[PDB]
Amino acid sequence: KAKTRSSRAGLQFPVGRVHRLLRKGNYSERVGAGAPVYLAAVLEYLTAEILELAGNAARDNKKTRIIPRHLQLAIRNDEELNKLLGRVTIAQGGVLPNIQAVLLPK
Amino acid sequence: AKTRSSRAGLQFPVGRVHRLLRKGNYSERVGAGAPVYLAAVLEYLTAEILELAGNAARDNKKTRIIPRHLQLAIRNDEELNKLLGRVTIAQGGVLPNIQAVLLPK
Amino acid sequence: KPHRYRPGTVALREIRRYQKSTELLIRKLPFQRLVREIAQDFKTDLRFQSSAVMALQEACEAYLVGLFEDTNLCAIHAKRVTIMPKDIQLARRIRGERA
Amino acid sequence: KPHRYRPGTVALREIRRYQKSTELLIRKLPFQRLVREIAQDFKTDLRFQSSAVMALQEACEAYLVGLFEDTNLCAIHAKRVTIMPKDIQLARRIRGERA
Amino acid sequence: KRHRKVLRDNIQGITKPAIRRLARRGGVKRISGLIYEETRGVLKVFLENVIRDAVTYTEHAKRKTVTAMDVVYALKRQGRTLYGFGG
Amino acid sequence: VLRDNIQGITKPAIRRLARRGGVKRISGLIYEETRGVLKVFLENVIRDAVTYTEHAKRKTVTAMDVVYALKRQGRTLYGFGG
Amino acid sequence: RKRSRKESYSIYVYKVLKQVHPDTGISSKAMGIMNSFVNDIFERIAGEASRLAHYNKRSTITSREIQTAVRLLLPGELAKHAVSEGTKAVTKYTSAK
Amino acid sequence: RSRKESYSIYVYKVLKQVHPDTGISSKAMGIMNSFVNDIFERIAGEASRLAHYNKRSTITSREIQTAVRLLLPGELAKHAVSEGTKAVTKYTSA
DNA sequence: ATCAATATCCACCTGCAGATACTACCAAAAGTGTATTTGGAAACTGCTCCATCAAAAGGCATGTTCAGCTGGATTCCAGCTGAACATGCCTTTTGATGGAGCAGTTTCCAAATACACTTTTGGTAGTATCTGCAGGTGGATATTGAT
DNA sequence: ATCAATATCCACCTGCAGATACTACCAAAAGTGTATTTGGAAACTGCTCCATCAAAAGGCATGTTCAGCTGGAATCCAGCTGAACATGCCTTTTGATGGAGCAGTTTCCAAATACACTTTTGGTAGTATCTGCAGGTGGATATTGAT
Ligand SMILES: [Mn+2]
Ligand SMILES: [Mn+2]
Ligand SMILES: [Mn+2]
Ligand SMILES: [Mn+2]
Ligand SMILES: [Mn+2]
Ligand SMILES: [Mn+2]
Ligand SMILES: [Mn+2]
Ligand SMILES: [Mn+2]
Ligand SMILES: [Mn+2]
Ligand SMILES: [Mn+2]
Ligand SMILES: [Mn+2]
Ligand SMILES: [Mn+2]
Ligand SMILES: [Mn+2]
Ligand SMILES: [Mn+2]
């Protein structure tokens, strides 16, 4: 019986595929065994972080299904995800509700 | 033995460009034409800047190109400035430029 | 006696409406013609995947919305509520799109 | 009466003077002092190549000069000739360095 | 044998109400009359630059069809990375 | 006299920088605003530089560490290697 | 003729979703976004690790290159946790076989 | 002690060809080195992505050309392509 | 218009930091020649999906009227920031001097690659069937604006 | 404050697009095992260049005064621009057809990698000669600002 390198690492994300993509990508001559494991963990962790916040945005909007709008809400409302993805456009994500105070009536 | 640079009519080192390409992890393979083409493009771009920087040296009554002359050459050239738009030249300073509204009278 | 909302009330209602939704605001077919006309001037006899045109429209609208945001800040900076061509130009200069 | 230049006359003179030259405009040692202090917060007992410090001062001064240009445009946009924090903040916001 | 009609002046297909709506999403409350032509000019430059790069990718791959990936790659190198249409 | 290091970046030096930036008239609050902006810049750049230093297992920040850091921040610098 | 296989991270994204929000689904377009995200961050990290190894005349990308790449790329807390999750995964991996 | 390569002597060669009686300071030579290295990286990097996008394992002159068109402004690109094609042509015949 | 006070420019000069021309030394690197491998261009063609078709209709663009209130011009003045001057404080120079540590060299093994074989899996593919929620209606609540 | 016109809300529901489910199939992917190669860590160490030291020298930062002039506040008003309405066009939607061309599979050789060997070159290190121009001087004169 064989164990996937993912299960060996305790990960959901595919360690094997990530290893292949690293070799196939011309990043370096050699790729250590620890590299795809570490990378797969980071990618999985970030995926979890975004899906957590997006799931909340969906709940906040009385929805059970995450759509691009929820992903955008989760990203732009989180300071660090917003910084990481500051040069990224989420298709069909729209923008945050934000009206400059001076534009309000009084 | 005749160097590939000579064989290509270039001052820039074709053999070195090739080695740098291979060891740079840009691809598994490198065609023989690629380092020739790339070395030529680099030589041409180098010639273009040195021409303009040389002129700038003349304009300032100097015979030796210094960083300031390179800055003047690039920023006064629409295309070189765009190419090097996110680049700072050390000890280059800036172009003389005063907004009209700040002038007296 | 016919009811009129004051100048600016409907504008604010429209801001809230469109900041809440995600649909494209430029009509589909006119944008497609613009893309084809522009591409045609660069290279004749091109074809487009439908998702290619949609990708362009998503990018163009997100670019213009973001630009209008910066433009708005430039107008407010000048103690105005009305965006003007010089606001757009200032925003693009500082962005490094004309500098 | 003893001689006295009108306000702004000498300022314009300084602009022409410093836009002509390329020498660094912050004193070397206070800058070197600042660099080491900040670096100490990331890793203790660091040493610096002399060229490393100089590379930082060139990059930092070129950055501030460029920022001051954009800041100047923002001030002029609001029909002022005096730059304010308001102007720096707007320039950095639109640049994408914040908000 | 037959070709489609000539394509011209399609930038005017970017109507004033379409530009107003975009400004609204951008948080704009009041719009000067000259904004609409300024915006069209700005959009055309943006579109030209992206399409030019996309078509360059297309030609390099010896294709006659511009793909979504051609555009995505074009957007990425112009520093306008786009999620949701491919790789 | 007791003196903070960021205050070592003096008003006249900031003034000269503004002058090269084509600035004619300067508000009093500019100098503290500038020092804060300066500090964030150095922090971002030096942090990345030191990170290159640590990875190379060195105790000396090189010019190349700085140059690599600046390239990451989109502030590419010519003249110091690379 | 069979159309060649188009690989994605969908089934893995989905697993993590259920770990995180068991009663929440995700549309195909949103999954499309997530796929773009993972691919993007992959290339960024891999790219930074590549330069890193080249600067230090190393021909091997190890977990140490990945880690420094993650610290350079991610801001504050995201980096802290990513590094921790990454280290934990490697120590567990090597402690087997 | 080990050796450190630069483009200095090639930059100097190109200088004497365009401005025979013009010198260049060491600082200015440093800038030129940074320039050549930068453009090399940009073009090589772009050609790399091109090859990858098209499931290619070889970077040829064709990839270098498309990369040049993508990276250089109009006229600089036109002349660069021309210079590049010229050098590969003469290298083929020589 | 005049006229005094500084700033600014041009011509010339000289010391020297930095450029240069030289000879010799050499490890690496580039060229050459031969054998071997293989990427990807050709050719052929299955089949996705792109361009084009029609036809019906209502969502939305266009154009106009009307006047609310915004932008721009004008004035005015308190006070903020520039100019100038008098101090004196600490940046700068540079030169010597330990010595930290970068970096070159040697050793050698944990870990990487190559490879052959076995097994597991994620990706269509074809149908088949739930299900979240878009969008419709209707009626109660809230907002805006006139008075 | 009252009230009326209209937007906004939210419960309720229904059709269905798209999500979920299942089986079947399998090519590529992933894992195992054995043998072979080697990247780079470790230890030692020489030499570069960094930190620090003294110690004037003075250039430049700091504190103060004074007032010119800018920023901001207030006032006015022409006319730009938003809101609303009538009209009807062209985008949207739905569905179908032909075929352009993208893409999948197979054959095949020009070109690339892989070695082994020879020859060239660029970086180097002292070593000595040379020179472009920074910086200083004087005196012409241009600019600025007072009358
Ligand atoms: Mn045309
Ligand atoms: Mn093959
Ligand atoms: Mn009126
Ligand atoms: Mn007003
Ligand atoms: Mn030691
Ligand atoms: Mn399965
Ligand atoms: Mn609804
Ligand atoms: Mn070895
Ligand atoms: Mn007064
Ligand atoms: Mn004023
Ligand atoms: Mn009509
Ligand atoms: Mn055909
Ligand atoms: Mn030689
Ligand atoms: Mn001089």
Residue numbers in the entry:
A (entry chain C): 13 to 118
B (entry chain G): 14 to 118
C (entry chain E), D (entry chain A): 37 to 135
E (entry chain F): 16 to 102
F (entry chain B): 21 to 102
G (entry chain D): 29 to 125
H (entry chain H): 31 to 124
Sentences from the paper on this structure:
We analyzed the biochemical characteristics of the reconstituted H4-acetylated NCPs, and solved the crystal structure of the H4-K5/K8/K12/K16-tetra-acetylated NCP at 2.4 Å resolution, for comparison with the unmodified NCP. The crystal structures of the H4-tetra-acetylated and unmodified NCPs were refined at 2.4 Å  and 2.2 Å resolutions, respectively, by molecular replacement as described in the Materials and Methods. The structure of the NCP with the K5/K8/K12/K16-tetra-acetylated H4 is fundamentally the same as that of the unmodified NCP. In the H4-tetra-acetylated NCP structure, the electron density corresponding to the residues from S1 to K20 of H4 (molecule B) is missing, which is quite consistent with the previous structural analysis. The main chains from V21 to I26 and the side chains from R23 to I26 are visible in one of the H4 molecules (molecule B) of the H4-tetra-acetylated NCP. As for the other H4 molecule (molecule F), residues S1–A15 and S1–K16 are disordered and residues K16ac–I26 and R17–I26 are visible in the H4-tetra-acetylated and unmodified NCPs, respectively. The electron density corresponding to the acetyl group of K16 was weak in molecule F of the H4-tetra-acetylated NCP. In particular, the position of R23 in molecule F and its hydrogen bonds to E56 of H2A and E110 of H2B, in the acidic patch of the neighboring NCP, are conserved between the H4-tetra-acetylated and unmodified NCPs. The H4 tetra-acetylation significantly increases the B-factors of the outward DNAs in 7–8 SHLs, particularly around SHLs –1.5 and +5.5. Thus, it is unambiguously concluded that intra- and inter-nucleosomal interactions exist between the DNA and residues 1–16 or 1–20 of the H4 tail, which are disordered in the crystal structures, and that the tetra-acetylation of the tail impairs these interactions.
